[PDB]
Amino acid sequence: PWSGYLDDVSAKFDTGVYNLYRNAQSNTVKVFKDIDAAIIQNFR
Amino acid sequence: SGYLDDVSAKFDTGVDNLQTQVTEALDKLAAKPSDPALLAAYQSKLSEYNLYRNAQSNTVKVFKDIDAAIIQNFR
Amino acid sequence: PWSGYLDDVSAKFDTGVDNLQTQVTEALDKLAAKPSDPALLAAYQSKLSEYNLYRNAQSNTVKVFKDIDAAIIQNFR
Amino acid sequence: DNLQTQVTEALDKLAAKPSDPALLAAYQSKLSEYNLYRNAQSNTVKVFKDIDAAIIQNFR
Amino acid sequence: DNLQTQVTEALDKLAAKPSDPALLAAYQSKLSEYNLYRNAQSNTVKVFKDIDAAIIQNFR
Amino acid sequence: SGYLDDVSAKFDTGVDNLQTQVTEALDKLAAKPSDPALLAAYQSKLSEYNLYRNAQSNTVKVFKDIDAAIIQNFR
Amino acid sequence: NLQTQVTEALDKLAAKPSDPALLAAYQSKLSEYNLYRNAQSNTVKVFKDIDAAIIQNFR
Amino acid sequence: SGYLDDVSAKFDTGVDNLQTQVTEALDKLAAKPSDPALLAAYQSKLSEYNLYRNAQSNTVKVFKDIDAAIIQNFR
Amino acid sequence: VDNLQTQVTEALDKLAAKPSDPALLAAYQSKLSEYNLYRNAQSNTVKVFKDIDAAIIQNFR
Amino acid sequence: SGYLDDVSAKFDTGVDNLQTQVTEALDKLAAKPSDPALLAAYQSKLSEYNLYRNAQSNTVKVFKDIDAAIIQNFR
Amino acid sequence: PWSGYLDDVSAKFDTGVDNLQTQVTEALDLAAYQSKLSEYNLYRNAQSNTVKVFKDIDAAIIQNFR
Amino acid sequence: LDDVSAKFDTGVDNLQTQVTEALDKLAAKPSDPALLAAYQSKLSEYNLYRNAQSNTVKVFKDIDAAIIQNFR
Amino acid sequence: NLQTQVTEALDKLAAKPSDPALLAAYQSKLSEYNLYRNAQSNTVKVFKDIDAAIIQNFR
Amino acid sequence: LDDRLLQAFSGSAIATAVDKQTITNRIEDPNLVTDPKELAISQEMISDYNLYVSMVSTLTRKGVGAVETLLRS
Amino acid sequence: LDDRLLQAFSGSAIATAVDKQTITNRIEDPNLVTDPKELAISQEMISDYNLYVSMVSTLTRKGVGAVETLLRS
Amino acid sequence: GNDISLIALLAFSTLLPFIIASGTCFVKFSIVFVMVRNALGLQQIPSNMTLNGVALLLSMFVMWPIMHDAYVYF
């Protein structure tokens, strides 16, 4: 199997512990995508 | 085949479990799109598949720029 | 190693906030253990915000200097 | 040269986990530092190798 | 040569499914390689047949 | 009828039916833009037709550039 | 003759410059004409350069 | 008189109404910029006006480049 | 000459009144483009003809 | 003063007070950025100033091209 | 004290709205605060775009020295 | 010519340093808008200078090169 | 003279290389100076070649 | 004398013929044409060849020119 | 004395070689390639090498061309 | 070797044949054969293109040891 950095964080929640759990999890995972997507565009 | 195929396969060979996880995870949600347990999981895999594809594409474009410069100065 | 100039201008941002680099992942585990605590939940929002801007401000500047330098080294030709 | 070897290694870390925000930033630098050096060197050789051509075209 | 054959074959697959990324990346890589080859070949052939002229202008 | 017409036709012959499906879908949705089952069908067909037309153009452009880069060495 | 096809491809496009099915045809035809006409001028120069060089062996 | 005026004139004579159609449609909209019926009619008039002016200028540029080549080979 | 030299000269003076007006750009770009070719296509032939007279006089003495 | 100095002054004497108006609108706006009545005006003047300053520079670059080629045929 | 043209332009906004910087901080230490917070957000946004445009106009001209 | 380069440095005399001070201060609080807005200006002015400096030397480089070929 | 025009326009610009009006006024001078200096050198070459041809012709 | 000259001629002819082919083979191998590391050498290899043949055809003409000038006149 | 030619030539040769290598070494440093200040100083350095070598080349071509037509008859 | 070694070698190759005419035995050989032709009185025949031919060949055997010793030194 394989687990990237996004699941470095998401799995913390499943292993840490309801909608707050689900919503807070999803927003945090989503915010990191927006940080990475910026750098990938400066690559060029 | 050449050097550009090689640097791309580094990414592909570097993450070889995800190629299937996306198809498997998509199939679970297709049967039950209303279940958070599957929906929340799929979100992480789809977002991961996106970054892999973009970084893999921009990297190849930069190397073909370094190659196209030198080839002109052969004249 | 070959530590050029662009390496310093990146490290200049890390070394100015490096006390926070670990502090971000520390708060995540606390909150992940209890997402329903407002005291933890409100504090985390500030640290995550600071981390986002820090990374974007590093990456913009390390492009600009790549675009100055690449101008001058055309006129060598 | 270290710069050639140093980029090859930063690339190999990203190939393992391209989604880490800390790993991506590191490679962006080394990939920028590598692109300039290749260009500055290619131009300089072109310059020098044509001076030696004019200096032969002049005398016959 | 294989390269000319292998580039033609890759195009045909994408044309039937231009919306699949698994085929796009394969075409991006190969096409970006064929054009660098096909340019580098042209300059070299020219350069050798320029010497073969200069080598005559000295004696003519 | 040069080579570029054939390079393009390779896409049009495979996707040859897409022109007719998109034209048809526009007419069905236009009768009642509110039917949800009609909207979802059109979204995919219009997008599938978008990437088709874009990917075709860039391929002709790449050959246009290598072709001009050889001919300048006729001098 | 190739001159007429490119001209007439322009004549359909100029009447409706927003139909993409016509643009994709004109992009093709206008490119081919560009490469052809450039390839002829260079080739003529080469043949005219050889004939002039010969005369300078004697003249 | 000139051949590049003919290439441009080929467009101006086909969409010849556009020069006045765009001017008129704007004058109406300024009377009630809130009317949805006037806006929708204007969007397409302005959009069609853009694609024309670009396609006119790129074509003129390409024809100049062909002529600009032959004039060098006179030497 | 003035038939062409005037087309180029006066169209610029129109553009100077509204450099931001596209019909004045469109009607200008074509003339300024059409002028660049005429000046180049003249100058080369003046050289070519005068290069022959120099070669005829060179060839005898 | 030469010819390329004369070509430039043509644009400055046609667009005689745009340079003044820009500093005036900018000077007023800087005192009260929250007023929408000032923003709509300034956007027009700044944009218009841009195309003037940009159009000017492109033509000087074309006329020194036509000249530099002719003073080559002196050679 | 070498201040260039882009600094002279930026200084116009910072000199036209001189106290606002203290007012927003001082008003924090809510109807009044909302108006000051709103006025500050617009001021900073207008200042950013202006130096970008002037910076890009000049970068065109110098590209035609070549 | 040998003065053409130096002619730019004398106008830019401080600027080469101010960008270093602003960058070193920004790195301490990259979330302060008063520092970010200031830095954008001083950084932008450094781009236009370094670029406009390079294009000019290339022009004068080639005036000299041309003349010394006409000596032949 | 043209050289004194360029010389002082260059120094005037260096005081503020980000001013749009100073840049526009420098683009023309640096253009006009280049065309002058090339036109001049190319004709001096022409005149010395003419006298070089006479002195050989009468050997 | 002459037998010593035949050797100097023979050596140079072969050394050139091997270099001409050595370069061409770098354009067929795809790991060389598409890698900047291997391209940077090709630009030097292709440059050094040009200078050698250009110099050898200049001096040998001037040698010939020095014989005509003694004999012809 | 015409042995001056040996002094002028010997000085110029060494002075040139030093500048060729210095330009090269200014490109092998990881920051002499990547700092604008140090790039701009390499542009002044690389212009001068080109003009100096070309001046000597064209002046010496004339000087020999004067002695040619003196002696030939 | 350096850039300046080309122009010194190139400049020498331009002036080469004047030294061989004025600082080499070829001057001696040339006169001797013309002196013979005069004694016989045959000033048309043999052609100078013949006498100057044999003379440059013979001089080669004499001077060659000095040239080989030099390029190997450099």
Coordinates of C-alpha atoms in Angstrom, one line a residue, chain H residues 1-5 49 53 64 67-68 71 74-75, chain I residues 7 22-23 26 30-31 33-34 37 40-41 44 48:
Chain H
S1 CA -4.1 49.7 -52.7
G2 CA -2.2 46.7 -51.5
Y3 CA -2.5 43.0 -51.1
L4 CA -2.7 43.1 -47.3
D5 CA -5.7 45.5 -47.5
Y49 CA -16.7 41.2 -32.3
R53 CA -10.5 41.5 -34.7
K64 CA 3.6 39.6 -44.0
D67 CA 6.6 38.2 -48.2
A68 CA 9.3 39.3 -45.8
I71 CA 12.5 40.0 -50.3
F74 CA 16.7 38.8 -53.9
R75 CA 20.3 39.6 -52.7
Chain I
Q7 CA -0.7 56.5 -47.1
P22 CA -9.2 49.6 -33.0
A23 CA -10.4 50.6 -36.4
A26 CA -6.5 48.0 -38.0
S30 CA -1.7 47.2 -42.6
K31 CA -0.2 50.3 -44.1
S33 CA 3.3 46.6 -42.6
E34 CA 2.9 47.2 -46.3
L37 CA 8.2 45.5 -47.5
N40 CA 13.3 46.5 -48.3
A41 CA 12.2 45.2 -51.8
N44 CA 18.0 45.1 -52.5
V48 CA 22.0 44.1 -57.3

